[PDB]
Amino acid sequence: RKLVHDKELAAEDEQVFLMKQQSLLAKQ
Amino acid sequence: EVEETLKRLQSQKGVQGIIVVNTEGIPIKSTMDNPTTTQYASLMHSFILKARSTVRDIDPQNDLTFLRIRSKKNEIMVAPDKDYFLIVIQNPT
Amino acid sequence: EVEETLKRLQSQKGVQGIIVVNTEGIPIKSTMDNPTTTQYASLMHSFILKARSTVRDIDPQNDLTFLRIRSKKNEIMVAPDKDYFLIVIQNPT
Amino acid sequence: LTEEEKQQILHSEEFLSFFDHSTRIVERALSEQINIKLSLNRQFFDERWSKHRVVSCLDWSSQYPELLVASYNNNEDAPHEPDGVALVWNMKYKKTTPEYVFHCQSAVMSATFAKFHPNLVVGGTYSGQIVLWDNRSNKRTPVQRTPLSAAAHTHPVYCVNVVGTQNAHNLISISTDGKICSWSLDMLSHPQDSMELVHKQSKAVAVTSMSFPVGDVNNFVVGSEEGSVYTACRHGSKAGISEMFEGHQGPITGIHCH
Amino acid sequence: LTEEEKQQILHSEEFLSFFDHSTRIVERALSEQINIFFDYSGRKLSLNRQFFDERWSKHRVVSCLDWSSQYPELLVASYNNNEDAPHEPDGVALVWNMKYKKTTPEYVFHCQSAVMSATFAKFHPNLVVGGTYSGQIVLWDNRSNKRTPVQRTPLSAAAHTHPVYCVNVVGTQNAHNLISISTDGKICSWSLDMLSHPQDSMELVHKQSKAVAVTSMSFPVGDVNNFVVGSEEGSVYTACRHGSKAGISEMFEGHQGPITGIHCHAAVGAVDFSHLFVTSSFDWTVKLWSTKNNKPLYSFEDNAGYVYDVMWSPTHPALFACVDGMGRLDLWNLNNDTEVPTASISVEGNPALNRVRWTHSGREIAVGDSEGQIVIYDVGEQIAVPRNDEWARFGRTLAEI
Amino acid sequence: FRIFSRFNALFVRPHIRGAIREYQTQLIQRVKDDIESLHDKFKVQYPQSQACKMSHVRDLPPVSGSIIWAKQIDRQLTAYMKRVEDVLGKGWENHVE
Amino acid sequence: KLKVNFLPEIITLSKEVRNLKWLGFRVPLAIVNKAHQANQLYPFAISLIESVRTYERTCEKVEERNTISLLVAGLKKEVQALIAEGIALVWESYKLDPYVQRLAETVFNFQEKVDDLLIIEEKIDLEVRSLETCMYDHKTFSEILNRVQKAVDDLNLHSYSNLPIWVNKLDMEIERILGVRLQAGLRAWTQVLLGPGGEPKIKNVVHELRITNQVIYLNPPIEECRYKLYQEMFAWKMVVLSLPRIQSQRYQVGVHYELTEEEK
């Protein structure tokens, strides 16, 4: 039983989150 | 900020040079011709070293704050702190 | 008329003591003991004689008119006369 | 030696007291010595800091009666200039330069000392921030500021003042809408006691001017834009506006108790 | 020689014209009289020594500490068993020294049972007496080469049958007694030359024959008949050894947790304070009490943690020291402050500190932990050295409350 | 708290409760930080804490020491109830905090 | 880019209607309604525009100081979830009434920990440069990594998302730059052996050629001499190789586990 490492839990940045929310409002 | 500090102490009349030395002896601040004043900065660097030797060897607990020098032609002001020093040159206006 | 001027300088704000250098590093007129008059004013004689040499290195026409040292416990003005000098020790406040 | 070493050590965190002692003691050494009814006393001007602005507040320190603060509006000639700037002047020396400059990003119209903390300079913005300057600190930018919240002040704040004793005291700030807030000086992160001064079926009054009575910490008085003088008590069962005065047919520009 | 006369140039009317010029420069100079504006210018415990034996003292608690009276630079430590090494002997006694800068223990001692407590023999400089988990009270000799105990008591029905958490050698030089109390009420009085059977032995009951599972004990200074204990009950019992009154005097309600350390007053001087004692317990409180009142005079509630030991400074009347298992050694000068600690230090990593002891001179404090790390601090001299008004200040501080 | 306990008609009257507002924010917030330290002390479990080991050092069996541990955490909880009671007077339970 | 649907000049309309009712002029009622909702919505929307403005400022400082994108991350997803849940609100909602205050609190806590991030980041990064500059010695780099270690420990009080792998990215960069410095020290040992790299002390090995009972031999042996030279190599390896490798987290108090010397 090694310390089996988790996945890359991460924050997406404000540029790519703002393009994501721009696509979310472009759908809206 | 040092250039406007240079400006409003250079707009004071009578001032020939704000040529302020460090503790290192380097001309860290100069406004006039540097080889004419770097050896005077070294002269005043060694003599502000003897002035700190004067205050710390005449008295134990005294700290040297400021020196007023009035010459025949000008009134040259020497300002120590406990870390870094100041030399400035004024004519009587 | 130095004596009633000294009696005026008995009662100025914070005069620590009144002396004068008299015989060119050797003071005579002392209101204090041997060290604080004599070898401190001889240190002042040596230091401002070599400072007269320093301003003389800046310009040999330019000798000294007046010196004042201020510090935390004493504000000492120095009046250089011709052969003898002058030391007056005063408080800052 | 090299210019990268000069631009490191000149902007390093050792020289700022060295520049404060440089500017202070050579501006102590601006004193020219000599070797040979109503009346004018002095004028003050700064060509960089005081051009094309109005004076909006003053205070003398009770500790230092030579010291005077001066709150300015924005220079609209220079939009790159900071809008609030506060300039500290002196009576002891004849120097035409100010002792301290302090500036802010919003325009200031109320500026005072703390009367138990004379090193602390308290300004108050057009935004409603209550900005704090210190002379022991370097920074002309304010060293403490309030939040801009609904719980805190959001209108232009023409008045801010301090009472309580040396051992316990409060910061009192009234705004244009009539919101009062109690503050600490150590902490400006939230108001302590904050409520709204209302009268006349709870209309929101438009408070301009401020006076304390001498020796009073609980009762006080305001003037207004509405031509109306209100006294008001701070705490208790009649916390809020006590009552109402009439007679002025203009908006009230300044009150002062005897 | 400067001059043949020093006077006549000061009495000359032409040299004094130059002096009149000099006083004209003085009268020019002294007309300013301007001062500098202020402009808001503005103007303890020290780490001494650490001890850690990697072979013996590793992963063991510091169970007890004692300083030798004839050797005040010496320091003993008691250790429990190591769960990391069950093959090792359980109790370990390592003797440590600050007159040398070696990190070795000066004398190593060990035994079969885990040593709960130890003391130095005051009147025998070569004997070290320890108390085990077994109730064998073991005796070591540093003259003999063995590390095994050279004498131990039986744990029979005449003797100590329960874990001994306090041992002391007290008495005169002619007449001294080894006093041990286990966790049952059994006190047995012993002689140092004979551990075969106790001199005097009985079991402490306090009310309706309830047993007193004794966790700690103290003596007043100079009092061999009377003493005081700290149980697990929360209840301190003042107790008298011999006379017609043998046993427990008083019922103290007091502490709400089991008592960890009780220590009577050790500083002797102008005003007697030897009726006073402080008590540390599991209820996070140090409780300053006296013998005459049956109530809490004062309780110290600043701790966020299990306080595990408290004792007086043996030179200063108001000063006392306390530790916890958070990791904070705390000094309190009651002339200075009855409200906040006078001094506090925290050990690196914050371990669970078990046992602390002052030195005899009142300047050094040595703390032990869960890890076998003896850490020595020196007390600062404005705190450590008592003054003559401090005895009167302690009297006015007790008369305040 | 002792000067609160001497002054209880002040806790009746609204002038004082308007006036003592900046102090009682600090008092309830330091009560909150003390009881949050008690919360975080109870978040670490008892043999994971040092006190089980120190109970086993000082002869105490650990179910008994767990009871001594949790009853002393309850005793500090009782003391913090005395603290919040002595801040807001009687009827402190009906307060908004 | 982020902006809000609001106009400050609307408080000018509120100022004008709060003056001109007092001057006796009967105003239209929808203007009174519009200035009334301006009076309700004035601190809240300017609290929104300071949250948006400081958000774009801290956006600029994390794209600039992107080196620490891993130490903002739980707070970053809280403020990204707060603006994504504040998509759905409108000005008629009374659900904005705690929401802008929770947003400004997370703006302030974001500012708090990004400036604490800046201070402890730049002190760590110049301490990485203190690994890069000073003398080839185990003790010197040990308190360098101890100050970086307790700096990571006090940043671990804040407890962001993907905090520990950022520390492991630092420690592998330490391990690579220490490989460069170990190459400097071993090449210094190589050049000092033949008669920034440190100061290698390569000592004289004393050998006496020896007769005992008509047998000429050498004592000490030459395999022992080569062995001793490899002891000075392995001691000159020991300066860099036993520098202690920082973990991803060292709040693992309950872990006594998985500790090898290449991880130690």
PDB file of all heavy atoms in Angstrom, chain G residues 191-221, unseen atoms left out:
ATOM      1  N   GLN G 191      39.166  18.422  -9.774  1.00  0.00           N
ATOM      2  CA  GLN G 191      40.310  19.278 -10.079  1.00  0.00           C
ATOM      3  C   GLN G 191      41.243  19.443  -8.880  1.00  0.00           C
ATOM      4  O   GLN G 191      42.461  19.574  -9.049  1.00  0.00           O
ATOM      5  CB  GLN G 191      39.815  20.627 -10.584  1.00  0.00           C
ATOM      6  N   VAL G 192      40.696  19.433  -7.657  1.00  0.00           N
ATOM      7  CA  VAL G 192      41.533  19.579  -6.463  1.00  0.00           C
ATOM      8  C   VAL G 192      42.249  18.257  -6.159  1.00  0.00           C
ATOM      9  O   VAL G 192      43.380  18.248  -5.642  1.00  0.00           O
ATOM     10  CB  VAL G 192      40.661  20.135  -5.301  1.00  0.00           C
ATOM     11  N   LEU G 193      41.656  17.135  -6.614  1.00  0.00           N
ATOM     12  CA  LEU G 193      42.242  15.798  -6.460  1.00  0.00           C
ATOM     13  C   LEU G 193      43.519  15.627  -7.284  1.00  0.00           C
ATOM     14  O   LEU G 193      44.503  15.037  -6.817  1.00  0.00           O
ATOM     15  CB  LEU G 193      41.199  14.752  -6.858  1.00  0.00           C
ATOM     16  N   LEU G 194      43.565  16.244  -8.451  1.00  0.00           N
ATOM     17  CA  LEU G 194      44.781  16.186  -9.253  1.00  0.00           C
ATOM     18  C   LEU G 194      45.793  17.268  -8.915  1.00  0.00           C
ATOM     19  O   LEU G 194      46.648  17.531  -9.767  1.00  0.00           O
ATOM     20  CB  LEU G 194      44.412  16.262 -10.730  1.00  0.00           C
ATOM     21  N   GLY G 195      45.767  17.907  -7.750  1.00  0.00           N
ATOM     22  CA  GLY G 195      46.727  18.943  -7.432  1.00  0.00           C
ATOM     23  C   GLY G 195      46.264  20.309  -7.898  1.00  0.00           C
ATOM     24  O   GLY G 195      45.731  20.457  -8.998  1.00  0.00           O
ATOM     25  N   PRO G 196      31.504  28.310  -5.865  1.00  0.00           N
ATOM     26  CA  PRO G 196      30.358  27.543  -6.365  1.00  0.00           C
ATOM     27  C   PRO G 196      30.611  26.038  -6.349  1.00  0.00           C
ATOM     28  O   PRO G 196      29.673  25.258  -6.196  1.00  0.00           O
ATOM     29  CB  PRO G 196      30.181  28.064  -7.796  1.00  0.00           C
ATOM     30  N   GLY G 197      31.869  25.640  -6.508  1.00  0.00           N
ATOM     31  CA  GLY G 197      32.255  24.265  -6.312  1.00  0.00           C
ATOM     32  C   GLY G 197      32.587  23.919  -4.885  1.00  0.00           C
ATOM     33  O   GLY G 197      32.841  22.752  -4.576  1.00  0.00           O
ATOM     34  N   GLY G 198      32.581  24.906  -3.994  1.00  0.00           N
ATOM     35  CA  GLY G 198      32.947  24.658  -2.629  1.00  0.00           C
ATOM     36  C   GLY G 198      34.455  24.554  -2.479  1.00  0.00           C
ATOM     37  O   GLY G 198      35.236  25.023  -3.309  1.00  0.00           O
ATOM     38  N   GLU G 199      34.857  23.933  -1.373  1.00  0.00           N
ATOM     39  CA  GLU G 199      36.265  23.784  -1.011  1.00  0.00           C
ATOM     40  C   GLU G 199      36.520  22.326  -0.649  1.00  0.00           C
ATOM     41  O   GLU G 199      36.286  21.913   0.494  1.00  0.00           O
ATOM     42  CB  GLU G 199      36.641  24.727   0.131  1.00  0.00           C
ATOM     43  N   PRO G 200      36.975  21.508  -1.606  1.00  0.00           N
ATOM     44  CA  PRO G 200      37.245  20.098  -1.297  1.00  0.00           C
ATOM     45  C   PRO G 200      38.557  19.917  -0.557  1.00  0.00           C
ATOM     46  O   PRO G 200      39.591  20.469  -0.937  1.00  0.00           O
ATOM     47  CB  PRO G 200      37.287  19.431  -2.678  1.00  0.00           C
ATOM     48  N   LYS G 201      38.505  19.129   0.510  1.00  0.00           N
ATOM     49  CA  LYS G 201      39.674  18.826   1.324  1.00  0.00           C
ATOM     50  C   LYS G 201      40.049  17.377   1.073  1.00  0.00           C
ATOM     51  O   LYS G 201      39.401  16.463   1.592  1.00  0.00           O
ATOM     52  CB  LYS G 201      39.404  19.072   2.809  1.00  0.00           C
ATOM     53  N   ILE G 202      41.083  17.172   0.267  1.00  0.00           N
ATOM     54  CA  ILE G 202      41.488  15.841  -0.175  1.00  0.00           C
ATOM     55  C   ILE G 202      42.834  15.562   0.487  1.00  0.00           C
ATOM     56  O   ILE G 202      43.864  16.139   0.123  1.00  0.00           O
ATOM     57  CB  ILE G 202      41.550  15.732  -1.699  1.00  0.00           C
ATOM     58  N   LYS G 203      42.819  14.689   1.490  1.00  0.00           N
ATOM     59  CA  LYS G 203      43.910  14.602   2.443  1.00  0.00           C
ATOM     60  C   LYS G 203      44.991  13.649   1.953  1.00  0.00           C
ATOM     61  O   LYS G 203      44.773  12.791   1.093  1.00  0.00           O
ATOM     62  CB  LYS G 203      43.392  14.151   3.807  1.00  0.00           C
ATOM     63  N   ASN G 204      46.173  13.813   2.535  1.00  0.00           N
ATOM     64  CA  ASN G 204      47.327  12.995   2.205  1.00  0.00           C
ATOM     65  C   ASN G 204      47.182  11.609   2.815  1.00  0.00           C
ATOM     66  O   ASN G 204      46.818  11.465   3.984  1.00  0.00           O
ATOM     67  CB  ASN G 204      48.604  13.656   2.721  1.00  0.00           C
ATOM     68  N   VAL G 205      47.467  10.589   2.018  1.00  0.00           N
ATOM     69  CA  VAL G 205      47.348   9.205   2.452  1.00  0.00           C
ATOM     70  C   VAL G 205      48.766   8.700   2.684  1.00  0.00           C
ATOM     71  O   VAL G 205      49.581   8.672   1.759  1.00  0.00           O
ATOM     72  CB  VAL G 205      46.593   8.346   1.435  1.00  0.00           C
ATOM     73  N   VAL G 206      49.051   8.287   3.915  1.00  0.00           N
ATOM     74  CA  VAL G 206      50.412   8.030   4.375  1.00  0.00           C
ATOM     75  C   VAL G 206      50.717   6.548   4.206  1.00  0.00           C
ATOM     76  O   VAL G 206      49.995   5.696   4.734  1.00  0.00           O
ATOM     77  CB  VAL G 206      50.579   8.462   5.839  1.00  0.00           C
ATOM     78  N   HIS G 207      51.784   6.235   3.472  1.00  0.00           N
ATOM     79  CA  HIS G 207      52.176   4.856   3.223  1.00  0.00           C
ATOM     80  C   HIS G 207      53.653   4.662   3.521  1.00  0.00           C
ATOM     81  O   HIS G 207      54.488   5.459   3.084  1.00  0.00           O
ATOM     82  CB  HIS G 207      51.872   4.462   1.782  1.00  0.00           C
ATOM     83  N   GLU G 208      53.968   3.598   4.255  1.00  0.00           N
ATOM     84  CA  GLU G 208      55.341   3.222   4.555  1.00  0.00           C
ATOM     85  C   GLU G 208      55.656   1.883   3.899  1.00  0.00           C
ATOM     86  O   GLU G 208      54.984   0.881   4.166  1.00  0.00           O
ATOM     87  CB  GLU G 208      55.565   3.142   6.069  1.00  0.00           C
ATOM     88  N   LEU G 209      56.653   1.875   3.022  1.00  0.00           N
ATOM     89  CA  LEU G 209      57.155   0.626   2.466  1.00  0.00           C
ATOM     90  C   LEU G 209      57.977  -0.074   3.537  1.00  0.00           C
ATOM     91  O   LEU G 209      58.705   0.576   4.291  1.00  0.00           O
ATOM     92  CB  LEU G 209      57.967   0.893   1.207  1.00  0.00           C
ATOM     93  N   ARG G 210      57.857  -1.391   3.619  1.00  0.00           N
ATOM     94  CA  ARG G 210      58.071  -2.057   4.887  1.00  0.00           C
ATOM     95  C   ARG G 210      58.768  -3.402   4.732  1.00  0.00           C
ATOM     96  O   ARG G 210      58.375  -4.234   3.915  1.00  0.00           O
ATOM     97  CB  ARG G 210      56.723  -2.244   5.582  1.00  0.00           C
ATOM     98  N   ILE G 211      59.799  -3.615   5.549  1.00  0.00           N
ATOM     99  CA  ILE G 211      60.443  -4.918   5.696  1.00  0.00           C
ATOM    100  C   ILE G 211      60.030  -5.471   7.044  1.00  0.00           C
ATOM    101  O   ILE G 211      60.297  -4.852   8.080  1.00  0.00           O
ATOM    102  CB  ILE G 211      61.973  -4.850   5.603  1.00  0.00           C
ATOM    103  N   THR G 212      59.392  -6.635   7.040  1.00  0.00           N
ATOM    104  CA  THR G 212      59.289  -7.464   8.228  1.00  0.00           C
ATOM    105  C   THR G 212      59.698  -8.879   7.848  1.00  0.00           C
ATOM    106  O   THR G 212      59.006  -9.524   7.048  1.00  0.00           O
ATOM    107  CB  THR G 212      57.876  -7.437   8.810  1.00  0.00           C
ATOM    108  N   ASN G 213      60.834  -9.324   8.424  1.00  0.00           N
ATOM    109  CA  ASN G 213      61.477 -10.640   8.227  1.00  0.00           C
ATOM    110  C   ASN G 213      61.806 -10.909   6.758  1.00  0.00           C
ATOM    111  O   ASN G 213      61.284 -11.851   6.152  1.00  0.00           O
ATOM    112  CB  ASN G 213      60.644 -11.780   8.829  1.00  0.00           C
ATOM    113  N   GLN G 214      62.632 -10.011   6.188  1.00  0.00           N
ATOM    114  CA  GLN G 214      63.190 -10.039   4.817  1.00  0.00           C
ATOM    115  C   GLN G 214      62.123 -10.005   3.721  1.00  0.00           C
ATOM    116  O   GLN G 214      62.354 -10.475   2.604  1.00  0.00           O
ATOM    117  CB  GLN G 214      64.119 -11.238   4.586  1.00  0.00           C
ATOM    118  N   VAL G 215      60.953  -9.442   4.009  1.00  0.00           N
ATOM    119  CA  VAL G 215      59.863  -9.367   3.047  1.00  0.00           C
ATOM    120  C   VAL G 215      59.557  -7.897   2.814  1.00  0.00           C
ATOM    121  O   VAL G 215      59.049  -7.224   3.713  1.00  0.00           O
ATOM    122  CB  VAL G 215      58.604 -10.109   3.528  1.00  0.00           C
ATOM    123  N   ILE G 216      59.851  -7.402   1.621  1.00  0.00           N
ATOM    124  CA  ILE G 216      59.506  -6.022   1.303  1.00  0.00           C
ATOM    125  C   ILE G 216      58.037  -5.956   0.920  1.00  0.00           C
ATOM    126  O   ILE G 216      57.591  -6.642  -0.005  1.00  0.00           O
ATOM    127  CB  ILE G 216      60.412  -5.459   0.194  1.00  0.00           C
ATOM    128  N   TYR G 217      57.274  -5.140   1.644  1.00  0.00           N
ATOM    129  CA  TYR G 217      55.857  -4.984   1.350  1.00  0.00           C
ATOM    130  C   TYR G 217      55.442  -3.549   1.634  1.00  0.00           C
ATOM    131  O   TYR G 217      56.253  -2.712   2.036  1.00  0.00           O
ATOM    132  CB  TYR G 217      54.987  -5.981   2.143  1.00  0.00           C
ATOM    133  N   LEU G 218      54.152  -3.292   1.430  1.00  0.00           N
ATOM    134  CA  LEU G 218      53.551  -1.978   1.614  1.00  0.00           C
ATOM    135  C   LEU G 218      52.487  -2.045   2.703  1.00  0.00           C
ATOM    136  O   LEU G 218      51.554  -2.853   2.616  1.00  0.00           O
ATOM    137  CB  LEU G 218      52.925  -1.492   0.308  1.00  0.00           C
ATOM    138  N   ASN G 219      52.621  -1.192   3.720  1.00  0.00           N
ATOM    139  CA  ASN G 219      51.639  -1.120   4.787  1.00  0.00           C
ATOM    140  C   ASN G 219      51.436   0.348   5.135  1.00  0.00           C
ATOM    141  O   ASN G 219      52.393   0.984   5.603  1.00  0.00           O
ATOM    142  CB  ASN G 219      52.076  -1.894   6.025  1.00  0.00           C
ATOM    143  N   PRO G 220      50.217   0.932   4.962  1.00  0.00           N
ATOM    144  CA  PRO G 220      48.860   0.408   4.636  1.00  0.00           C
ATOM    145  C   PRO G 220      48.634  -0.115   3.202  1.00  0.00           C
ATOM    146  O   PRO G 220      49.458   0.188   2.355  1.00  0.00           O
ATOM    147  CB  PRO G 220      47.959   1.638   4.895  1.00  0.00           C
ATOM    148  N   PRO G 221      47.623  -0.945   2.929  1.00  0.00           N
ATOM    149  CA  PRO G 221      47.447  -1.470   1.567  1.00  0.00           C
ATOM    150  C   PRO G 221      46.915  -0.429   0.592  1.00  0.00           C
ATOM    151  O   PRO G 221      46.316   0.574   0.982  1.00  0.00           O
ATOM    152  CB  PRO G 221      46.446  -2.611   1.762  1.00  0.00           C
TER     153      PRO G 221
END
